[PDB]
Ligand binder design. Structure first.
Ligand SMILES: CO[C@@](NC(=O)[C@H](C(=O)O)c1ccc(O)cc1)(C(=O)O)[C@@H]1NC(C(=O)O)=C(CSc2nnnn2C)CO1
Ligand SMILES: CO[C@@](NC(=O)[C@H](C(=O)O)c1ccc(O)cc1)(C(=O)O)[C@@H]1NC(C(=O)O)=C(CSc2nnnn2C)CO1
Ligand SMILES: CO[C@@](NC(=O)[C@H](C(=O)O)c1ccc(O)cc1)(C(=O)O)[C@@H]1NC(C(=O)O)=C(CSc2nnnn2C)CO1
Ligand SMILES: CO[C@@](NC(=O)[C@H](C(=O)O)c1ccc(O)cc1)(C(=O)O)[C@@H]1NC(C(=O)O)=C(CSc2nnnn2C)CO1
Ligand SMILES: [Zn+2]
Ligand SMILES: [Zn+2]
Ligand SMILES: [Zn+2]
Ligand SMILES: [Zn+2]
Ligand SMILES: [Zn+2]
Ligand SMILES: [Zn+2]
Ligand SMILES: [Zn+2]
Ligand SMILES: [Zn+2]
Lengths: 264, 264, 264, 264
């Protein structure tokens, strides 16, 4: 009767289904997979990447950057929504092979430093190569790359360092306000009376209102299905996409229903 | 015309004036200096230290621990109010010479990891040996050592990771509620429109209310003069000490007056 | 045609076969598994652990410590042979649950900091929760715990920070010289012309001579079969154990034969 | 009788005397000060900096990079001889303001991570802002930037991670072999029987022979006076410069004389 073997982080096949660069705005592209969002922003002074997906997506992220004309030494900054392996996986490998710098808040930095281990709810089950944050950003701080400004909005809940990123792009000259907000879900979490997260409910409630007030003409999420995106249908990908109000209110209804069924 | 030399962190002499262990409660002692608070809590399973003072106070903190009968291997945990050199200085040396573990939040951990460098308001002017945090604590989390529970209360403002620690001790059997709250000052800070701290005012206002609601029969601060303590007069040290209400309201009046004179 | 799933570090069942504490000397015990060595040294001032095994062995290491009468707060120091997941796995969890400090050289520390990721030969295939080294030791440095001195001997090869630990114990008063040397194997490594390790051959040759000259009356290795130990037969576990000379010369013959078959 | 104040790292004025970019080869420039070497290598794919000097030289290093036409985002890599404050000072600030990556060995990385604190011989006396190493290099490893290859040669002694860097440049088409070797001095060190460095003598002796065998047509050192350079006289700066043989043999004579006077 020996000890159990180690279990590997296994996800659905659609999360690992590679796709071609899909354009979001004049300077914004989707270079992740069918069910995982990885946003690339091309500026006059380099590129910016937001999230990366599963750890084995590093080679795919570099190939689509080459398709857009972004050499590895042109990737300047890496921004993160939260430091889970399904979104910050290939960050450590991308830093070695691109020379880019990582910007994140203190909570995402300490979670990225230990590779997702010692998670508040998952423990050491979902881990990935660790990476060090190069610049610590605060709530409301602005990050400027090539004339494009990225504003961070802390929305703690899914992770303590969950962050929504906003910036103003253009769509054939006409301006567009992009809001890439993090997941508002609490999958299998203990909500009431969590010793590792005593203020989890208060953080979620304050995060629901934060998403509602984000300046947003076009919302994206780390998982496209959460905001009713569909990367597979190309030009119709953002047709049925939700607003910030509809995304936050739909997640809060699921939160209260999950919080009510935990009391039972 | 050469470049300027490096300037050393020089403080008042009363900050470095060593004193004997002054008793606060049955299990709580003051082992710092006349104008710097370093609290020792002796339990049945070891000791707990809260803050340390200037970096050159390491030898003094160990001598007073020996006076109380606490061997270096008996110091179990190190708690921090905030990670400035005048309070987290000898932490790196204390870890090497005691085998203790450091518990702090994510913001204090990342500031302790770079030794106070790259400060939001002071830059690299006030630095000290860096130390790594061993356990990350959240807001409201409980730390239990030898049957004594320490509850963390985040009060961001002076530093993003400023933390107030509360625990229930006894005074000859009779219970006492101790609240060791951090400094609420903003010395020379840019309050309105700080690019390194855009939500500084909102964090201070939410911290004022946090201190007022702390369960406290006896308040202590990293600087004794902030709460009208006087470690030099021995038995009369806590005579004119302020309450949590009086400490927060007095700091908020100084904050609003300083915030008003910044508009000019 | 999606991307491949993540593969889990799967080892033989005998590596995860728990066993009872087997005594080596008066103060030395084997508390690992049948095919993985985890040595515990009990002193008057606490305990010392050398290696831990697979990451899922943390609970087993704590149970055998309780069998020997070693509370979690009594584990003082953790020493490592090398920072691979099959020997430094549960180190991160053991630090959180015991308050112990980790001592290792600079090469083992940087490999332990990134959880075995970015390995010189294995890449990100074999990973484990990361841990931070608390004390950096040099070649020939002495570590003293409870009157028992541990001397480090750098033997680079298997990993750049591979370390052999030696100490003098007793066997019913009569002294015994224990040498816990690391693995000298190079499983699947590129030996000649490795860009990640240009001096790999010179490091192995200098490590062969280092093991031969270790003061040793009783040799142990991270894998018991490497030194012909057999933890399952209890009192006869060290019967057919090899000497330091026989262990180094046998590994060098396998190294030269492997180095010769790489030229082909 | 209070505790002593903190003392600042104060050096000679000539170390902080700024100078204009002095050309060494077609692609190599000296952009440090009169008595501190900071080498810039301009390639087709960016620039490479070797050492930086005192921590307050960050602004000077950026101004001379602008004089050579190197924007902050064009500095690709930072290489270090050793991690003392008089040569790795502004590294932390240069990383934030340039987006460059730092490459160093494991010993220099762990010393750079704690900002020179806990030095083997100096303790916490000479400290500087800490920085994290992005890429770990081994002995003999090659670093290629813009077609120019940098080979690392470990020469432990002054620091455990002391490193000599070599590369082949041109001088009007004609090739030149540059060797930037680290200091071989042991200022005020305990050489025989150092508990923090038991193999200090063996490391120095093996480092003397390493410098002698470096492929070098033109030698530079972190301090120009060590190799008889004189940055002030412009075109005659390398006139009386020493060879690798003359530099190593002169330092070994001073080492043996210092080692002999320690026995007394
Ligand atoms: C940790 O990764 C998530 N979960 C998992 O992958 C699996 C799990 O559910 O435990 C394992 C998670 O964060 O819960 C990720 N996250 C989201 C999300 O939208 O947040 C969705 C949808 C599920 O997959
Ligand atoms: C960084 O250390 C403080 N300031 C200084 O020591 C000096 C400064 O004022 O700049 C330097 C600070 O935090 O401002 C410390 N802190 C408090 C406090 O009560 O917070 C009081 C009182 C001043 O001394
Ligand atoms: C990384 O762990 C080792 N290998 C593996 O576990 C597997 C592999 O062989 O790749 C994976 C290794 O270090 O090669 C370990 N180490 C030793 C050793 O004795 O060094 C023996 C025996 C094999 O198992
Ligand atoms: C730590 O910086 C050095 N020393 C100092 O700056 C001062 C000291 O001597 O203690 C303090 C040192 O390393 O010894 C530096 N290094 C060298 C050298 O050439 O190595 C020379 C010459 C002296 O200045
Ligand atoms: Zn997630
Ligand atoms: Zn997710
Ligand atoms: Zn302060
Ligand atoms: Zn202060
Ligand atoms: Zn191994
Ligand atoms: Zn192994
Ligand atoms: Zn030096
Ligand atoms: Zn020097």
């Amino acid at each position: 009767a020996p000890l159990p073997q180690l279990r590997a982080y296994t996800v659905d096949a659609s999360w690992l289904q590679p796709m071609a660069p899909l354009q979001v705005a004049d300077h914004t592209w989707q270079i992740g997979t069918e069910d995982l969002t990885a946003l690339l922003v091309q500026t006059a002074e380099g590129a910016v990447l937001l999230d990366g997906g599963m750890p084995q997506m590093a080679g795919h992220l570099l190939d689509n950057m080459k398709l857009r004309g972004v050499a590895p030494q042109d990737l300047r900054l890496i921004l993160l929504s939260h430091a889970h392996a399904d979104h910050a996986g290939p960050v450590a490998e991308l830093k070695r092979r691109t020379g880019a710098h990582v910007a994140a808040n203190a909570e995402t930095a300490v979670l990225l430093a230990r590779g997702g281990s010692n998670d508040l709810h998952f423990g050491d089950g979902i881990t990935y190569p660790p990476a060090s944050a190069d610049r610590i950003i605060m709530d409301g701080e602005v990050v400027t790359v090539g004339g494009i400004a990225f504003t961070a909005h802390f929305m703690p809940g899914h992770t303590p360092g969950s962050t929504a990123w906003t910036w103003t792009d253009t769509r054939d000259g006409k301006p567009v306000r992009i809001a890439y907000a993090d997941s508002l879900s609490a999958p299998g979490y203990q909500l009431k009376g969590n010793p590792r997260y005593p203020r989890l409910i208060e953080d979620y409630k304050r995060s629901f209102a934060t998403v509602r007030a984000l300046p947003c003409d076009l919302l994206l999420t780390p998982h496209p299905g959460a905001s009713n995106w569909n990367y597979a249908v190309g030009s119709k990908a953002s047709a049925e996409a939700l607003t910030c109000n509809a995304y936050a209110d739909a997640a809060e209804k699921k939160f209260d229903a999950q919080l009510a069924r935990e009391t039972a």
